[PDB]
Write an enzyme that holds these catalytic residues in place. Structure first.
Site, PDB file in Angstrom:
ATOM      1  N   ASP A  46      22.039 -28.670  16.555  1.00  0.00           N
ATOM      2  CA  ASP A  46      22.091 -27.931  17.945  1.00  0.00           C
ATOM      3  C   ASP A  46      21.883 -26.058  17.111  1.00  0.00           C
ATOM      4  OD1 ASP A  46      21.536 -27.517  20.161  1.00  0.00           O
ATOM      5  OD2 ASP A  46      23.561 -28.702  20.437  1.00  0.00           O
ATOM      6  N   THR A  79      17.198 -24.375  24.145  1.00  0.00           N
ATOM      7  CA  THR A  79      17.785 -22.868  23.695  1.00  0.00           C
ATOM      8  C   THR A  79      16.973 -23.125  22.239  1.00  0.00           C
ATOM      9  OG1 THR A  79      19.516 -24.424  22.864  1.00  0.00           O
ATOM     10  CG2 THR A  79      20.005 -23.339  25.074  1.00  0.00           C
ATOM     11  N   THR A  80      17.487 -24.208  21.740  1.00  0.00           N
ATOM     12  CA  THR A  80      16.119 -24.035  19.934  1.00  0.00           C
ATOM     13  C   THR A  80      15.086 -23.625  20.173  1.00  0.00           C
ATOM     14  OG1 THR A  80      15.834 -25.691  20.223  1.00  0.00           O
ATOM     15  CG2 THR A  80      17.910 -25.278  19.467  1.00  0.00           C
TER      16      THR A  80
END
Lengths: 511, 54, 65
Positions: A46, A79-80
């Site tokens: 993550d 977010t990634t």
């Protein structure tokens, strides 16, 4: 040019963060190890957790990680994706700066490209027309099983769906905040016995006060002292004045008795006491007296939970004892103690008047790690549902939106004038990184996959990308991975604003 | 396929020749070695998905 | 050399434990501390005792345990 060099340094730091995060994008993204001075490492895929744990120091890197945090807090996920899309926007930015385009023109062109992208995603989506139970449940199931989390999604997600629906049913443009739907943890129990609960449930405090049950339990917030005055000592005299502490606390007991009698004439049935450390303790004998006329207390509630419950039970803050009015209380329908659901005593309160039908999810399990997996699963479910409700959409994921946008926005830049046209074309060339890197985290080579996707979107078939069930280009239907567009459009908007800010900089000065 | 009894010739643990490891020889439980292979593969995945330390 | 740095560490651990795989394997001298000389030929004990210094070896030995 000194400002140009500083801006290149900023965009290079953004490049470093984006390159660190890139390979962890997607369900099949690789793992990273994070090494710090504490003497060990952690393994995670993550990128959000990587940026949280990363020792970010550079100003531009700080802006990018703030972007990741903002994306996580505002949109459900991605977010990634937003970090890497911002990084490749900065890539096109450095290329255009080498071509000599001034940053402000780049910024305005990125605004035009961003509005075109918002429009095209608006045209990407199939109107999900979610209005009732079945639509929300189907959308939640497809969104959840399209991602990594699948073991308990179909089990625990429906209760969250029902709660976030029953709080606000109709087609309100604004959706429920997570600050309006808070979750509570019980280490005991199982997974299936989790439930949606109106009002509040919290650990045990009260004893020997008819704790079995109370009807129409008047709940009163407390942020004021209920004990003797405290100083350098608990008394203003020598702690060895054996005859004297008795003769002064015999009227101090009368004082606290007047306090609890005032609580009685207020009309309370149970009490809500604020966090303790910033206040003196509470005298348990005053609790014993307030027990005998059948009044309970609850204490050590965290502040955020305080304003939560108070605005969800129609009780305004209680800064002092003087405000004796009966309306000052909340009016819950029932306060009762559930016992058999594992070790521990749960003070659950429900049925109070509220501006909205607030609900809390009682998450349950058998292990601390079980509690953690359950809690972030329900958090992801809640945020996905709320962002779905904010903008009704189920666009295809896994590279489809940005390939199709890169195509259409390249056409738009072709139709556009000025340096803005070339910059918008660079916007499209930047955004085609994320399908490329999703392929580069699959078995397929990125270049052939991205050109195949572009050809497919240039030949109809406006939803095609890389899924999780395999690596090849199979997203016509069924196995296609889908997301609500709001996550993607938020990624675009936030990343575009961040790159606007980054190129908007010439120099970073110290005060 | 006629030589199906040949499925289980292995090296002798305490020697350097291949022996028929059912008519004679050593045996090891199927569960322990199948889990050995499984955990070896899971290790080779967990440590190979690593890219960089940061 | 960002993945090979992990592969080579795991391969080094394998090379250390390799010479003692079978019942006829050689003996390993493992000293996690000065003077605490230990001689065992079962690789499980040395894996429990070998002080790995690289996080890849850390996780591989953790999965072995």
């Amino acid at each position: 040019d000194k400002p140009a060099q500083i801006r290149f340094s900023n965009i290079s730091a953004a490049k470093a963060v984006a390159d660190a995060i890139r390979t962890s994008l997607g369900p099949k993204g690789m793992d990273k190890m994070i090494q710090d001075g504490k003497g060990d490492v952690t393994i995670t895929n993550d990128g959000a957790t990587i940026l949280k744990q990363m020792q970010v120091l550079h100003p531009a890197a700080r802006m990018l990680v703030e972007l990741s945090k903002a994306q996580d807090i505002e949109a459900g996920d991605g977010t990634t994706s937003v970090v890497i899309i911002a990084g490749s926007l900065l890539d096109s930015c450095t290329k255009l700066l080498q071509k000599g385009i001034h940053p402000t023109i780049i910024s305005e062109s990125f605004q035009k490209a961003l509005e075109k992208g918002i429009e095209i995603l608006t045209d990407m989506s199939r109107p999900v027309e979610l209005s009732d139970r079945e639509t929300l449940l189907n959308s939640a199931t497809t969104s959840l099983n399209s991602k990594v989390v699948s073991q308990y999604s179909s089990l625990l997600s429906p209760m969250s769906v029902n709660a976030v629906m029953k709080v606000i049913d109709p087609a309100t443009a604004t959706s429920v905040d997570l600050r309006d739907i808070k979750i509570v943890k019980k280490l005991g129990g199982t997974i299936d016995d989790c439930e949606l609960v109106e009002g509040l449930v919290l650990t045990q405090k009260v004893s020997n006060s008819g704790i079995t049950r109370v009807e129409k339990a008047k709940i009163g917030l407390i942020q004021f002292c209920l004990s003797a005055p405290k100083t350098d000592m608990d008394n203003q005299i020598v702690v060895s004045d054996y005859a004297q502490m008795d003769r002064v606390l015999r009227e101090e007991r009368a004082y606290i008795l007047n306090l609890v009698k005032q609580i009685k004439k207020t009309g309370c049935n149970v009490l809500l006491i604020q966090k303790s450390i910033l206040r003196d303790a509470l005298s348990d004998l005053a609790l014993h007296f307030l027990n005998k006329m059948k009044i309970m207390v609850i204490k050590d509630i965290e502040r955020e939970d305080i304003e939560f419950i108070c605005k969800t039970i129609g009780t305004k803050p209680v800064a002092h004892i003087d405000q004796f009015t009966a309306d000052m209380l909340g009016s819950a329908e029932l306060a009762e103690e559930v016992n058999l659901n594992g070790s521990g005593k749960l003070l659950k309160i429900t049925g109070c008047a509220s501006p909205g039908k607030t609900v809390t999810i009682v998450v349950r399990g058998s292990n601390k790690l079980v509690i953690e997996e359950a809690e972030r699963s329900i958090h992801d479910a809640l945020c996905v549902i709320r962002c779905l409700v904010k903008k009704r959409a189920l666009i295809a994921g896994g590279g489809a939106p940005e390939i199709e946008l890169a195509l259409r926005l390249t056409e738009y830049s072709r139709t556009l004038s000025g340096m803005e046209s070339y910059c918008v074309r660079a916007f499209a060339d930047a955004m085609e990184v994320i399908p490329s890197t999703l392929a580069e985290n699959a078995g397929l080579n990125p270049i052939s996959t991205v050109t195949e996707l572009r050809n497919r979107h240039a030949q109809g078939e406006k939803t095609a990308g890389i899924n999780v069930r395999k690596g090849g280009i199979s997203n016509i239907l069924e196995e296609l991975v889908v997301q609500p567009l709001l996550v993607s459009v938020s990624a675009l908007t936030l990343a575009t604003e961040t790159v606007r800010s980054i190129l908007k900089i010439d120099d970073v000065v110290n005060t | 396929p006629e030589r199906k009894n040949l499925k289980w010739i292995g090296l002798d643990l305490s020697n350097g020749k291949p022996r028929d490891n059912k008519q004679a020889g050593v045996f090891e439980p199927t569960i322990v070695k199948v889990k050995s292979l499984k955990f070896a593969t899971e290790a080779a995945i967990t440590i190979l998905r690593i890219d960089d330390l940061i | 050399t960002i993945r090979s740095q992990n592969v080579m560490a795991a391969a080094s651990i394998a090379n250390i434990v390799k010479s003692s795989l079978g019942p006829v394997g050689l003996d390993k001298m493992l000293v996690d501390d000065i003077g605490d000389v230990t001689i065992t030929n079962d690789g499980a004990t040395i894996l429990k005792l070998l002080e790995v210094e690289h996080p890849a070896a850390k996780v591989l030995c953790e999965l072995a345990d």
